[PDB]
Design a protein around this ligand. Structure first.
Ligand code: 72C
Ligand code: 72C
Ligand code: ZN
Ligand code: ZN
Lengths: 340, 340
């Protein structure tokens, strides 16, 4: 039987790491991409806390046996805390205590502390006030989590760093989070419209502030090139709505960049979408083009499956190249071809 | 190597038959349900002639290698003739000759003659004039089909009976079609809003007019109970948009009748949709309810897969019970439970 939570780093290259998170429901290979569980029929999937508490409701999910039984997914599940107004929480009611209990009822394996994702841009004073409240909320999340024996003994809790783009606030947040103590640490408050250069700049000083021996989760990121750059800066875990969102709107990710398959230039293109996935085996660009142009749900479903599969192939190549000490070369080859 | 076209009846019960159509691309077990090929990832599928000639166009499909390569389906394909205004054809241009050539370019295995599907209701004089033109068009379809060696030697041609609800016109149409000679015979002009009692009434006298030793295809039908009743009256082949249409709109077919899965009574129902299909294995009514209510494409896709699978399980039970001489009992048990 695996432990509740064990992170081990198998290989490093510069700031990049590769390794495994062991949990009771399975092993997560890192760097990891964590897709939304409702995308299609990955070592871990995401549950949509905010949606689930509104429909059918966390208590109803609990009565139906929890998210694992509900979704037919017996491997780990991560839930966000739902925050993405007062010291107690937010009314719209949601608080650190209520957020933790909701995630408990859903049965998730990785529980996010309840935070306040600072808007961008933000003054230093606003970013500081928001970070300080998130740190008080992180301590309340820790305590609520620890009060529930089933949760404390079988789940894991991640703290979320805030502080906007300010190095001194990011440092203070990391210090507060480490002193409380969490199983993993998320870099929050990015992917809120800052642009890639700025995000990378903030990651450059922010990730080393976190405990090196714990997983680092960059919330909301991102495009394939965002992921490569963030692994280069020490991120271990990723979630992003892009692969599933893009699939509905006609956008496919390939090693040569994203393409819009609805474009007329693909109407007679017999090459597959890119790739090893089942879609790229049997289906041409031309046929997927046709399905999507015709409004057929099969088209969107095949596009979504390809995009999900592409992200996992990307993460596999990242893990292998770090393990083999050629990630720097991989990142360089990836960007030359992706932006060609 | 199989023949171009061979229909053999293995067992009969009353007017019902069960058997096989052998074609070069495979064997079709009858009675057969023929789903639209673009529904999901059946012994034969349907191509949408009218749509395909508009996008991307029949010549473009031919340049891409034909429908089999285009869709990744190496088994038989049936295409309708596109008719569903003058003696030459219809402008909107489509004629018996053009319809046959389009179906040739698409590469379909079973080719429908170009007909005029009489509107309902229709006076005897209108039904007669329309049937008479369809019979002239059927002879032109035969000749065009026979002029193309690749088509005549590798495909099959079905004639379509018309005549509305009038026994004397149905008889005249069957006579004209048999004298021309076709590989199979469709009963056309039903499922146009006549209601099940009327359709069954017309089938009662119309199907025995067709050659007994050739397959009988009831176009556009239908609901599961329509199919059972039409097999009881000697139909061998079916197509219907219902299983794929219903899946998008929340309707699932079950042995206890159709249900609308969006209905709140399914929000905590842990039973599967019905069934042996992959959906009914892993997925509860409650989770599919949730997916569809949330607008998730996965929900519609799972509903469509279930409906397609249900129709094929229905056809398998029909074939087995005819083969075992218990179809009359099956039909009775089916209706008692389906309408309970
Ligand atoms: C898109 N950019 C982006 N998303 C972020 C999230 C929400 C992430 C969750 O919301 C949605 C995603 O699919 C289901 O779960 C995922 C964040 N969540 C919290 N709690 N705190 C943050 O600072 C934060 C920052 C983010 N930046
Ligand atoms: C729904 N009721 C219904 N559909 C019918 C059709 C069209 C059937 C085709 O149209 C659509 C279906 O999915 C793609 O291919 C299928 C018919 N087609 C021809 N040529 N002649 C007929 O008398 C006729 C009667 C029908 N009654
Ligand atoms: Zn692919
Ligand atoms: Zn099923």
């Amino acid at each position: 039987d695996r432990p509740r939570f064990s992170f081990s780093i198998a290989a490093r290259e510069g700031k990049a790491r590769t390794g495994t998170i062991e949990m009771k429901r399975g092993v997560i290979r890192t760097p990891a991409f964590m897709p939304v569980g409702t995308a299609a029929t990955a070592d871990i999937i995401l549950g949509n806390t905010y949606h689930l508490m509104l429909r059918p409701g966390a208590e109803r999910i609990a009565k139906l046996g929890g998210l694992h039984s509900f979704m037919g997914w017996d491997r780990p599940i991560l839930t966000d805390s739902g925050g993405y107004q007062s010291e107690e929480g937010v009314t719209f009611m949601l608080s650190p205590e209520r957020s933790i209990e909701i995630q408990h009822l859903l049965g998730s394996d990785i529980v996010m502390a309840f935070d306040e994702c600072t808007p961008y841009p933000a003054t230093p004073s606003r970013a500081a006030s928001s970070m300080e409240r998130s740190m008080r909320w992180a301590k309340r999340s820790r305590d609520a989590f620890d009060s529930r024996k089933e949760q404390a003994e079988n789940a894991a809790l991640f703290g979320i760093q805030q502080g906007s783009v300010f190095e001194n606030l990011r440092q203070q947040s990391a210090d507060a989070l480490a002193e409380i103590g969490f199983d993993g640490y998320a870099v929050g408050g990015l992917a809120v419209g800052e642009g890639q250069d700025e995000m990378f700049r903030v990651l450059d000083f922010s990730v080393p502030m976190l405990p090196d021996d714990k997983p680092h989760y960059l919330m909301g990121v991102g495009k394939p090139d965002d992921i490569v750059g963030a692994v280069e800066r020490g991120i271990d875990m990723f979630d992003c709505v892009l692969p599933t969102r893009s699939g509905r709107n006609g956008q496919a990710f390939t090693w040569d960049g994203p393409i819009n398959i609805r474009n007329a230039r693909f109407s007679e293109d017999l090459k597959p979408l890119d790739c090893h996935c089942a879609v790229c085996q049997k289906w041409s660009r031309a046929y997927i083009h046709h399905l999507i142009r015709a409004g057929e749900i099969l088209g969107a479903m095949l596009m979504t499956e390809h995009n999900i599969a592409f992200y996992q192939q990307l993460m596999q190549k990242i893990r292998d190249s770090i393990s083999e000490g050629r990630f720097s070369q991989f990142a360089q080859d990836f960007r030359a071809r992706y932006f060609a």
